[PDB]
Design a protein around this ligand. Sequence first.
Ligand SMILES: *[C@@H]1O[C@H](CO)[C@@H](O[C@@H]2O[C@H](CO)[C@@H](O)[C@H](O)[C@H]2NC(C)=O)[C@H](O)[C@H]1NC(C)=O
Ligand SMILES: [Zn+2]
Length: 361
Amino acid sequence: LATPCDEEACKLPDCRCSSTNIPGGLRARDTPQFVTVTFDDGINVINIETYREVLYGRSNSNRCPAGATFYVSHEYTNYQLVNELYNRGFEIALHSISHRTPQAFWADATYQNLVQEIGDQKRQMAHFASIPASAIKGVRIPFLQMSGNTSFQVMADFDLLYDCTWPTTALTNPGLWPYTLHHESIQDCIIPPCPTASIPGPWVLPMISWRDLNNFPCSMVDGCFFTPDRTDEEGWFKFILTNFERHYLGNRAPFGFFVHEWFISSNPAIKRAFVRFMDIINNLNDVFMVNSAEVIDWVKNPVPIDRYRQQQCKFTMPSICRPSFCGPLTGTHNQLSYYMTICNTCPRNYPWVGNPLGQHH
Ligand SMILES: *[C@@H]1O[C@H](CO)[C@@H](O[C@@H]2O[C@H](CO)[C@@H](O)[C@H](O)[C@H]2NC(C)=O)[C@H](O)[C@H]1NC(C)=O
Ligand SMILES: [Zn+2]
């Protein structure tokens, strides 16, 4: 059971307490503003068109490729398209093998449940997308449903670096910065149960809630209730930038744009506001559209804007896809049949929970 923070024991780069103070003792105006654009759930031939259109070719003002985090769930994911996203410099993260309903399952999952749903997905993902296992570091639990200590224990066991499942509404201005779980967390638990054990090793990357038009909090853009009309491009542009300014003109805590792709392609006016927002921050000299792992990397060794701008761009190790089209595949638990596009040789059976590489019978 974790104790309150021993500000003398908890030291970078290995340990940090839950706090709204800027890492490294930096002043806000010397602190880079990070933006983490993220997309949940399965990668397929439809939503990849949105990702190519609004993300490809972008760069930050330091000429590094602008990043984004894909919390990928396994079912109906085209792993050749995952490989493509990885090779354009975007981060591939875990969102479970099954994404199974109901949400209540994830609140209670056993250690073994999350080993098989998340821990095993790391090698599943590296295998079928043919990307370095070391590049897989992030976790978002389905339905934003925390699992107490359990998910963080699994992360420690499988060298996953950070979780981005845990929103805050009380700690948004000044915003709560990432922290480790060596000690007790001050973060509010909107979606219980939250971890209270001392679990050294993984990081919490809080989802700092947005504020909607009536000041109600929302964790994801497509979860905001009081919102401009879907056809009102200018209203959505002002809505996005107002939430962004709360960070940029505040303590500069990482600003999230957490969405499902459906919300972007279903609403062309929102997509246009979204594109304009990205165009603006790509032209700002102290704002950076990055992968979520790069936020943890900065918190671990915080540097002022001027030195951050001198750091080398992320290194994206190229990894070729040798594509295979596989099927019909079936599983022992699945009842369904499947076809798959992967960057490896075809498995004998459908990869699933308890058989993550489709290898066994
Ligand atoms: C997570 O780990 C902590 C630390 O072991 C667990 O803490 C227990 O919490 C209950 C109250 O819910 C206390 O009655 C126990 O005494 C605590 N144990 C210890 C050793 O202090 C916690 O229950 C675990 N599970 C969850 C879901 O948080
Ligand atoms: Zn999801």
